[PDB]
Design a protein around this ligand. Structure first.
Ligand code: HEA
Ligand code: HEA
Ligand SMILES: CCCCCCCCCCCCCCCC(=O)OC[C@H](COP(=O)([O-])OCC[N+](C)(C)C)OC(=O)CCCCCCCCCCCCCCC
Ligand SMILES: CCCCCCCCCCCCCCCC(=O)OC[C@H](COP(=O)(O)OCCN)OC(=O)CCCCCCCCCCCCCCC
Ligand SMILES: CCCCCCCCCCCCCCCC(=O)OC[C@H](COP(=O)(O)OCCN)OC(=O)CCCCCCCCCCCCCCC
Ligand SMILES: CCCCCCCCCCCCCCCC(=O)OC[C@H](COP(=O)(O)OCCN)OC(=O)CCCCCCCCCCCCCCC
Ligand SMILES: CCCCCCCCCCCCCCCC(=O)OC[C@H](COP(=O)(O)OCCN)OC(=O)CCCCCCCCCCCCCCC
Ligand SMILES: CCCCCCCCCCCCCCCC(=O)OC[C@H](COP(=O)(O)OCCN)OC(=O)CCCCCCCCCCCCCCC
Ligand SMILES: CCCCCCCCCCCCCCCC(=O)OC[C@H](COP(=O)(O)OCCN)OC(=O)CCCCCCCCCCCCCCC
Ligand SMILES: CCCCCCCCCCCCCCCC(=O)OC[C@H](COP(=O)(O)OCCN)OC(=O)CCCCCCCCCCCCCCC
Ligand SMILES: CCCCCCCCCCCCCCCC(=O)OC[C@H](COP(=O)(O)OCCN)OC(=O)CCCCCCCCCCCCCCC
Ligand code: CUA
Ligand code: CUA
Ligand SMILES: [Ca+2]
Ligand SMILES: [Cu+2]
Ligand SMILES: [Mg+2]
Lengths: 269, 45, 59, 47, 534, 77, 55, 102, 66, 236
């Protein structure tokens, strides 16, 4: 093109973001969350509806932030190749941070199992705690997670090849698969023998599997918003970062559950 | 070659002031609490 | 429904902030602002009773 | 986006065109910063 | 002006806001330090009437304030968000709304820390928050929960800024810049971002386990229940020693720059400096259990950890000797950043040598929880972070503010904080080696002499701080006047000894970094066309 | 006696002795119900756990034994 | 003519390095052989007198 | 690669002959004197020629002043300024010490 | 420039004297001394330590006060 | 044995461990002083030689020889100071047939000493708590915050095994004249071994934060002779 016409554009690929209030809005919501839960833990607020309201404000502020970012990527078209490479690497580094949190939980488990305390009874699991059996329910959980991984990669390659109804059906099937995982995990927590207060086994067990449960609820939300954006034509054939982000999140959560399954059940029992 | 005074001479005349100045500066920077203990009552003076 | 081209036209042809450019923006934005103001006014309001010692009455 | 730039447009506060003196705000900021722990000590010693 | 600061999305406004919150909280931490040292002047309860709980509360307030709210916001936030997009030529850092939420999640961490101090009793657990002292049986009330939430909010800020810094310096470099052609401050904040990203998960894990023990009846750390308190020490120090290397490594970035620009010669082996910073960053995560040589680790474990801790003396020695090699043979222009660099060099070497004497697990029998370790860490933290901060301020503030500061006042401020910090932190080694324990509000009355001379030094340090915040006022109201008279230093680099003054005036800034050819206070969006480099 | 004690036990050569005292208490109580023929070799574990364990721990484990709460490998058989 | 005069900084660096190592060695030789040896001589003298009064 | 002394001499002779205005004469002289060697008198002779060719006196005084601050003795300065006596007499530059007599 | 070295020396001396003046003031607005900070108390402490012959080759005397 | 006003060194040794770690500390401070003298001389001679250099040698950049020399020089310095640290660590970690075992279990702001191997009447254990003497109860001559109610008395020239645990929070058991510092996690026991070579009194404190009463929590070990100790123990 000419020089007059080249003078009207960015001259550098990276996104020049408009000013937005959602950082200070999410920050104020997070402060009110921390304050209200520290005042409701110790009886200074009577009931939990304040903490419920603070969680609701934090959620809606995060949703409005994500609404602005899908607006900038879809309608404003500000995500070029450099910005796409940047948000891909940024999601990769956040995923590495969550993996390291789970490494901390695995350190707590391996310490409290390799050094069995004398009040527990010098055996892992402790005396009186019947462990969760591996083969009954978590085998079903881990095979539907592995099939969720196969289903997201089938739906992603069906998206790249152009086929719409195969990719939509793949993303719908894998979203219902991981909510079947969430439901089976809630069922396992409902009919389980020990509590979170039942010593360090219940402590680190429900800590690790509950943090993974929380990440799978987050992946449920991400697969839902990705199904909505694929249904309403937001995702192209060569331009989609929400999908690549959600499927690398799916595979990392699958690997975390594989390690959680093998250690916490096949080595815990 | 070797025009002038030797390197031993013309660098010793720079170093021998600097050894004494460095010893003074470090003995102030490290041995200042000796003055507080010296004037202190725990020397019984 | 493929509103992507039409929303590209609406969003690029607008002198409004980015959270206001959709036609349904007020429908989210007004109750969110009211609920946010309440949710950040109240736990700050419960700090004098926290530093005073008055726990919440169990009624 | 295009904001104003120059010698005093880089900072949040207002130094030159000002009704009160600047020294008022500039030392009140650091004074309440220095007196936050005295408020803390007063509350804990009153308790 | 509501938009530009509240709804901010460019890096420099976020940077000056980071610096303002950093210096506010640093004033508060210095006040808590003054009150601590005032109570520790003479034996017996002098000012706090008994009330060792308030002294412990001010100890954790001073510690957590000076670490997580002065040095980390200042060094990481303000200097990273000003120079890291600038010194690589990036337009505005990638994810600027993450860059804004990190700053705005900091001062509410300050708010909930202050309200932890105000509520029922205050967190009196030390800055390490060791159970069962920080558990619900010893510390009832909501205070340690709010201190934990302060640590969680600043952990969010550090991690999100670390992600932002990694993808900014990886993805958004200018066109001529390979990774090998980067500056040392950019490399330093890159390595610091990686250590933040790989450390703050274990801190968040251990702190949330502490919170779960406190309020949800679970037992990670309660012995009545099978829990083990040493797990918190392992988790917290796997954060903790990477944290102190995070605090020191931006100083290693700043000092390379002020030393190379005030010796008028480049850094000696700059790629070896990159390798040494990365070696220190890798070697941090392997040495974390030198802080707990006392708990009863195995002899082979301690014999490992003393060797692993001693191995980091080699790359820090390579850095400290390459700085001497940069200053050797140059032409020293002793402005105040050069004064802070020289004082950093000497006093950080002294703190590192006391740390090497602390690295041995047989001698940490004799020195653990004495004032010898506070001599070591206040030496490396105070000098290597505050002198780095003052060097960065007096180095970059004429450029990023357009207002020159008074130079005579800057040198009296440097000298006062130099001798005051020496007078406060040198007798701590004597108190420690004679067996004075740590975190005590009162002592046997054989420690009163060195406690008196250190409490004399604290007033010198606070006077130098009050002088520094006067230098700030004098810079902000008379900066252009300071340029037009001879009360400051206009040119950081003098002409060389052949160079005419008009030949200099056509080329008045000779730097190996971008930031000094930018206009005083720079453009709100500079780099329209990208900065090219061979 | 002029200053005798337990000595050096190779099964716990390291610094912490928490499993030493526990295993000695469990083995002293295991000598009573299982073997019951060597009362003076039963007193070796008695002197060892008596020298290593604190009195509060001995009282707590004795109450947990007498109430059945004791988590040790105790087979009355 | 003028013989080529080159390398003053190299001679200066190795002279400064060995002078600094010898200065620090003088400091440490004073430290050990005066202070540490004086404390050890006082302690060994006390234990000699203690064994003598135990005889 | 390290340059030998005569290679340095040839390179800075060529550089001072190719220099074309005052910025280049002062640049070539700055990184001529910022090595760990006093330059050979042919290099100083070319420096005085190149400062004459760009019609600037005080850099040709700065040659001798930088030579004074660069050389190691007080006798090698004499050996230099008597071996450049005819060149300095031909151009007519003073030394700084006989220009400001104090 | 020619007067600044003397001005920075006089400034750092003014800072030292002013800071120890402020230390004297807020020290004078302090609490009472400990009852064990006496010459006669510390002589009896030395007497007890000499009876127990503590610190035999070092110093055992705590006097330090008046 | 007791801290000294305006002191700068360790307290006087009473055991092979403390004199071992004092010898190791001086053997470390030797080489720390040679490199402190090197860095301080180099910094001083550099600033006072080149604050008045007009031409800066801007072509000194890589220099591989001193790079490999200052890489391998701290290696041998840390090797030299890590030889006796390994010898001392693996020496003081040994427990070789203790003639005595005493527990020192640290309760919340006091100590509980327990001579559980020994007798009071016939076979029963000896135990006593050791509170600090309060400031209102100090008769004239007692050290403040150091002279406790009941001292832990201990025979001389005999191996003692200290098994320290806690009750509430982490309390450290530290006597620096005896070279012992080992903390009390409430979960587990921790042993240390020390033999005392001379009679006298040795003071210490809780070297870990114990709440409000962390300051007033002293330790007093009175090393007496063996007939005097047996007289004290049959009296107790
Ligand atoms: C950031 C690290 C840092 C710094 C700089 C300091 C600086 C000081 N500290 Fe502290 N301190 C800690 C971190 C730090 N401290 C930690 C982690 C603990 C542990 C708590 C525990 O163990 O439980 C501790 C504990 C501690 C103790 C031990 C008490 C005890 O446990 O018994 C003492 C004793 O006097 C003390 C006092 C001081 C004093 C007088 C200063 C003086 O140096 C103050 C003078 C400093 C300044 C004047 C700084 C300048 C001010 C600025 C705002 C910078 C401005 C520059 C820019 C903005 C660019 N603090
Ligand atoms: C500024 C941050 C910082 C830095 C850089 C360091 C650096 C080092 N630290 Fe430290 N440290 C702290 C912050 C820091 N530390 C804090 C905050 C605590 C207390 C925590 C708490 O109690 O809560 C602490 C406590 C601490 C302990 C725990 C002791 C205890 O709690 O009982 C140990 C033990 O190994 C230690 C050792 C070291 C060593 C070997 C280095 C080395 O990295 C130093 C390297 C530098 C040099 C070695 C000097 C330069 C090199 C040369 C001049 C070459 C020649 C040298 C040789 C040949 C050796 N320090
Ligand atoms: C402005 C001028 C103010 C002058 C005040 C004059 C009064 C005075 O001389 O004060 C002496 C101070 C007192 O300090 P103190 O001995 O700790 O007594 C404090 C008060 N009690 C605890 C008894 C309640 O003692 C001190 O503060 C000692 C001075 C500080 C040491 C300076 C040494 C300088 C060496 C160089
Ligand atoms: C900042 C990032 C922090 C990262 C580290 C977080 C580590 C802790 C994870 C907590 C999971 C707890 C759980 O999932 O708890 C699951 C249990 C399940 O009940 P049960 O199975 O015992 O029922 C008995 C019969 N089966 O619910 C509870 O009983 C209540 C648990 C405490 C209340 C919820 C706490 C939520 C904190 C989440 C923090 C997330 C961030
Ligand atoms: C808490 C609830 C978490 C819910 C997460 C929903 C994420 C949807 C955002 C989105 O969809 O962002 C869409 C953009 C890009 O969209 P695109 O270029 O593919 O658009 C195609 C236009 N043709 O993805 C990203 O920038 C990266 C997404 C990272 C999300 C990480 C979320 C972390 C939350 C922390 C908790
Ligand atoms: C390094 C050298 C430091 C010298 C300080 C001079 C002290 C002046 C004084 O005040 O010393 C006073 C004391 C005398 O006191 P006394 O015990 O006789 O008191 C009796 C009252 N009744 O001198 C000494 O004990 C000798 C001091 C020797 C130095 C030992 C240093 C060991 C700790 C190192 C500290 C950290 C060093 C940093 C890294 C290298
Ligand atoms: C405090 C007293 C204020 C009195 C105001 C009276 C108003 C009457 C009218 C007077 C004129 C208007 C005044 C308003 C303007 C104003 O002053 O700015 C107001 C703000 C806060 O305002 P607020 O929300 O608290 O005000 C409530 C009413 N709106 O102050 C400040 O940030 C003070 C900041 C101190 C200076 C910090 C110095 C350090 C900066 C370092 C930067 C360099 C970084 C380099 C490294 C990266
Ligand atoms: C916990 C923190 C989770 C961090 C996820 C970051 C993903 C990588 C990334 O960078 O995601 C990109 C977005 C920010 O993009 P932006 O609009 O600033 O970028 C503009 C150019 N595209 O992340 C987010 O929306 C994070 C939303 C946080 C929600 C609240 C979390 C509070 C806890
Ligand atoms: C253990 C010793 C080292 C300790 C650490 C070093 C000290 C730290 C401070 C260093 C400051 C100077 C560095 C910049 C100099 C520079 O960069 O010089 C650059 C010059 C370039 O030479 P070139 O042009 O020939 O080669 C060009 C191609 N390389 O190389 C040198 O000068 C060589 C110097 C050799 C030094 C040998 C040291 C011998 C003494 C060892 C110790 C003996 C102790 C005896 C005690 C009785
Ligand atoms: C460096 C300059 C600043 C250092 C401050 C030193 C504090 C003085 C002090 O600490 O004073 C304590 C001592 C001893 O007084 P005392 O034990 O009788 O104290 C009982 C209550 N006053 O007073 C002095 O000896 C003053 C003379 C000290 C000389 C210092 C010179 C340093 C050079
Ligand atoms: C208590 C323990 C610490 C004690 C410290 C020493 C005690 C003295 C305290 C300070 C007194 C004030 C003097 C002001 C001097 C002045 O006025 O400087 C003016 C000078 C000269 O100027 P000019 O030659 O251009 O001409 C002016 C006349 N027309 O320029 C300088 O700045 C250079 C001198 C400072 C050198 C840099 C030092 C940086 C810190 C080093 C840290 C230690 C490293 C060495 C370790 C061995
Ligand atoms: Cu304690
Ligand atoms: Cu304690
Ligand atoms: Ca006191
Ligand atoms: Cu560390
Ligand atoms: Mg400790």
């Amino acid at each position: 093109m000419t020089h007059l016409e080249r003078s009207r554009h960015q001259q550098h690929p990276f996104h020049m973001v408009m000013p937005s209030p959602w950082p200070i809005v999410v920050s104020f919501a997070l402060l009110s969350l921390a304050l209200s839960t520290a005042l409701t833990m110790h009886g200074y607020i009577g009931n939990m509806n304040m903490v419920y309201l603070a969680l609701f404000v934090l959620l809606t502020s995060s949703i409005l932030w994500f609404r602005d970012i899908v607006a900038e990527a879809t309608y404003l078209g500000d995500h070029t190749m450099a910005v796409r490479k940047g948000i891909n690497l940024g999601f990769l580094m956040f995923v590495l941070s969550e993996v390291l949190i789970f490494a901390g939980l695995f350190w707590a488990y391996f310490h409290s199992a390799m050094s069995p305390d004398v009040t527990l009874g010098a055996c892992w699991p402790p005396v009186g705690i019947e462990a969760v059996q591996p083969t009954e329910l978590p085998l079903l959980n881990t095979i539907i997670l592995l099939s969720s991984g196969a289903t997201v990669t089938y739906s992603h390659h069906a998206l790249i090849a152009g086929n719409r109804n195969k990719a939509l059906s793949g993303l719908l099937i894998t979203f219902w698969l991981i909510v079947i995982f969430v439901t089976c995990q809630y069922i396992e927590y409902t009919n389980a023998a020990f509590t979170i207060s039942d010593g360090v086994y219940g402590s680190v067990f429900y800590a690790g599997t509950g943090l993974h449960f929380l990440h799978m609820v987050m992946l449920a939300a991400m697969l839902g918003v990705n199904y909505w954006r694929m249904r309403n034509y937001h995702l192209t054939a060569g331009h989609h970062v929400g999908y690549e982000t959600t499927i690398i999140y799916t595979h990392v959560l699958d690997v975390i559950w594989l390690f959680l399954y093998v250690v916490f059940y096949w080595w815990g029992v | 070659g070797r025009i002038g005074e030797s390197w031993v001479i013309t660098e010793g005349r720079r170093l021998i002031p600097e050894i004494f100045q460095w010893s003074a500066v470090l003995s102030v920077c490290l041995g200042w609490p000796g003055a507080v203990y010296f004037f202190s009552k725990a020397r019984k003076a | 429904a493929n509103k992507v081209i039409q929303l590209q036209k609406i969003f690029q042809s607008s002198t409004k902030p980015l959270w206001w450019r959709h036609p349904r923006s007020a429908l989210y934005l007004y109750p969110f602002y009211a609920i946010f103001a309440v949710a950040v006014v109240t736990p700050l309001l419960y700090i004098p009773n926290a530093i005073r010692g008055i726990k919440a009455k169990k009624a | 986006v295009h904001f104003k730039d120059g010698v005093y447009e880089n900072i949040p506060f207002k130094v030159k065109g000002r009704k009160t003196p600047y020294a008022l705000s500039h030392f009140g900021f650091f004074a309440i910063g220095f007196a936050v722990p005295f408020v803390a000590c007063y509350v804990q010693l009153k308790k | 002006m509501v938009q530009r600061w509240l709804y901010s999305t460019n890096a420099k406004d976020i940077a000056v806001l980071y610096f303002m919150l950093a210096i506010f909280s640093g004033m508060a931490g210095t006040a808590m330090s003054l009150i601590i040292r005032l109570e520790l002047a003479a034996p017996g309860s002098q000012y706090l009437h008994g009330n060792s709980q308030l002294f412990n509360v001010l100890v954790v307030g001073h510690a957590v304030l000076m670490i997580f709210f002065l040095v980390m916001p200042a060094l990481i936030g303000g200097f990273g968000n000003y120079l890291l997009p600038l010194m690589i030529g990036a337009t505005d850092t990638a994810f600027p709304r993450i860059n804004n939420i990190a700053f705005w999640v900091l001062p509410m961490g300050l708010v909930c820390l202050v309200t932890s101090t105000l509520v029922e009793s205050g967190a009196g657990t030390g800055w390490t928050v060791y159970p069962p002292l920080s558990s619900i049986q010893a510390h009832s009330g909501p205070s340690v929960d709010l201190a934990i939430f302060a640590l969680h909010l600043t952990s969010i800020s550090s991690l999100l800024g670390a992600i932002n810094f990694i993808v900014t310096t990886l993805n958004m470099r200018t066109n001529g810049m390979t990774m090998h052609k980067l500056p040392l401050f950019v490399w330093s904040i890159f390595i610091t971002a990686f250590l933040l990203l790989l450390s703050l998960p274990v801190l968040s894990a251990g702190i949330t386990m502490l919170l779960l023990d406190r309020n949800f009846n679970t037992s990670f750390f309660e012995v009545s229940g099978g829990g083990d308190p040493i797990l918190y020490e392992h988790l917290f120090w796997f954060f903790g020693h990477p944290e102190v290397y995070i605090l020191i490594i931006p100083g290693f970035g700043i000092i390379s720059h002020v030393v190379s620009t005030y010796s008028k010669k480049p850094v000696f082996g700059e790629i070896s400096m990159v390798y040494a910073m990365a070696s220190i960053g890798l070697l941090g995560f392997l040495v974390w259990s030198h802080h707990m040589y006392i708990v009863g680790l195995d002899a082979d474990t301690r014999a490992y950890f003393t060797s692993a801790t001693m191995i980091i003396a080699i790359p820090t020695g390579i850095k400290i000797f390459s700085w001497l090699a940069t200053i050797h043979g140059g032409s020293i222009r002793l402005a105040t950043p050069m004064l802070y660099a020289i004082a950093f060099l000497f006093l950080f070497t002294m703190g590192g040598l006391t740390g090497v004497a602390l690295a041995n697990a047989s001698l940490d029998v004799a020195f653990h929880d004495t004032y010898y370790v506070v001599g070591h860490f206040h030496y490396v933290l105070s000098m290597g972070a505050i002198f780095s901060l003052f060097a960065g301020y007096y180095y970059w503030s004429p450029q990023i503010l357009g207002l020159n500061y008074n130079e005579k006042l800057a040198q009296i401020q440097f000298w006062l904080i130099f001798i005051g910090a020496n007078v406060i932190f040198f007798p701590m080694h004597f108190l420690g080696i004679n067996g004075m324990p740590r975190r005590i509000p009162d002592y046997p009355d054989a420690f009163a002499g060195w406690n008196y001379v250190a409490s004399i030094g604290s007033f010198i340090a606070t006077l130098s701080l009050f002088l520094f915040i006067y230098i700030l006022y004098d810079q902000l109201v008379n900066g252009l006047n300071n340029k037009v008279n001879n009360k400051s230093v206009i040119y950081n680099k003098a002409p060389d000894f052949v160079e005419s003054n008009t030949i200099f005036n056509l080329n008045t800034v000779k730097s190996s970094s971008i930031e000094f050819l930018l206009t005083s206070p720079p453009a709100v969006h500079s780099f329209n066309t990208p900065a090219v480099q061979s | 006696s002029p200053l005798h004690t337990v000595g050096f036990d190779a099964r716990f050569p390291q610094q912490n002795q928490t499993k030493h005292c526990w295993q000695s208490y469990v083995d002293y109580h295991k000598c009573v119900n299982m073997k019951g023929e060597d009362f003076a070799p039963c007193k070796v574990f008695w002197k060892t756990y008596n020298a290593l364990c604190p009195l509060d721990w001995i009282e707590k484990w004795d109450d947990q034994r007498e109430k059945g709460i004791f988590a040790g490998d105790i087979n009355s058989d | 003519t003028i013989a080529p005069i080159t390398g003053t900084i190299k001679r200066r660096v190795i002279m400064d390095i060995v002078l600094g190592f010898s200065l620090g060695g003088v400091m440490a030789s004073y430290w050990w052989w005066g202070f540490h040896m004086d404390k050890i001589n006082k302690r060994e003298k006390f234990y000699a007198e203690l064994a003598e009064r135990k005889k | 690669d390290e340059e030998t002394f005569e290679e340095f001499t040839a390179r800075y002779e060529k550089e001072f002959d190719e220099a074309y205005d005052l910025f280049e004469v002062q640049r070539v002289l700055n990184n001529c004197f910022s090595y760990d060697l006093v330059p050979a008198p042919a290099v100083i002779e070319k420096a005085l020629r190149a400062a004459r060719r760009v019609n600037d006196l005080p850099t040709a005084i700065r040659v001798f002043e930088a030579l004074k601050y660069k050389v190691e003795n007080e006798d090698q300065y004499k050996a230099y300024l008597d071996e450049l006596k005819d060149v300095r007499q031909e151009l007519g530059v003073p030394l700084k010490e006989e220009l400001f007599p104090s | 420039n020619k007067g600044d070295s003397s001005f920075i020396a006089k400034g750092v001396a003014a800072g030292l004297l002013f800071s120890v003046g402020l230390f004297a003031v807020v020290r004078m607005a302090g609490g009472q001394d400990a009852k064990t900070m006496n010459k006669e108390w510390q002589l009896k402490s030395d007497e007890y330590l000499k009876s127990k012959n503590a610190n035999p080759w070092g110093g055992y005397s705590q006097v330090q006060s008046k | 044995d007791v801290p000294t006003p305006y002191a700068c060194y360790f307290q006087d040794s009473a055991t092979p461990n403390q004199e071992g770690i004092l010898e190791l500390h001086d053997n470390i401070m030797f080489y720390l002083l040679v490199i402190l003298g090197l860095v301080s001389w180099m910094l001083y001679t550099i600033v006072m030689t080149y604050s008045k250099n007009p031409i800066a040698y801007k072509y000194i950049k890589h220099g591989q020889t001193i790079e490999v020399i200052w890489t391998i020089f701290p290696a041998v310095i840390l090797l030299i100071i890590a030889f006796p640290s390994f010898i001392l660590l693996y020496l003081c970690d040994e427990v070789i047939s203790p003639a005595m075992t005493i527990k020192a279990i640290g309760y919340q702001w006091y100590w509980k000493y327990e001579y559980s191997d020994f007798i009071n009447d016939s076979g029963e254990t000896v135990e006593f708590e050791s509170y600090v003497i309060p400031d209102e109860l100090l008769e004239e001559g007692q050290l403040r915050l150091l002279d406790t109610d009941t001292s832990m008395v201990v025979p001389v020239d005999t191996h003692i095994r200290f098994v320290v645990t806690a009750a509430d929070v982490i309390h450290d058991f530290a006597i620096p004249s005896l070279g012992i510092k080992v903390d009390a996690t409430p979960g587990r026991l921790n042993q240390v071994s020390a033999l005392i070579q001379r009679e006298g009194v040795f003071y210490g404190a809780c070297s870990e934060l114990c709440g409000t009463g962390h300051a007033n929590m002293p330790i007093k070990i009175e090393a007496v002779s063996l007939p005097k100790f047996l007289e004290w123990l049959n009296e107790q």
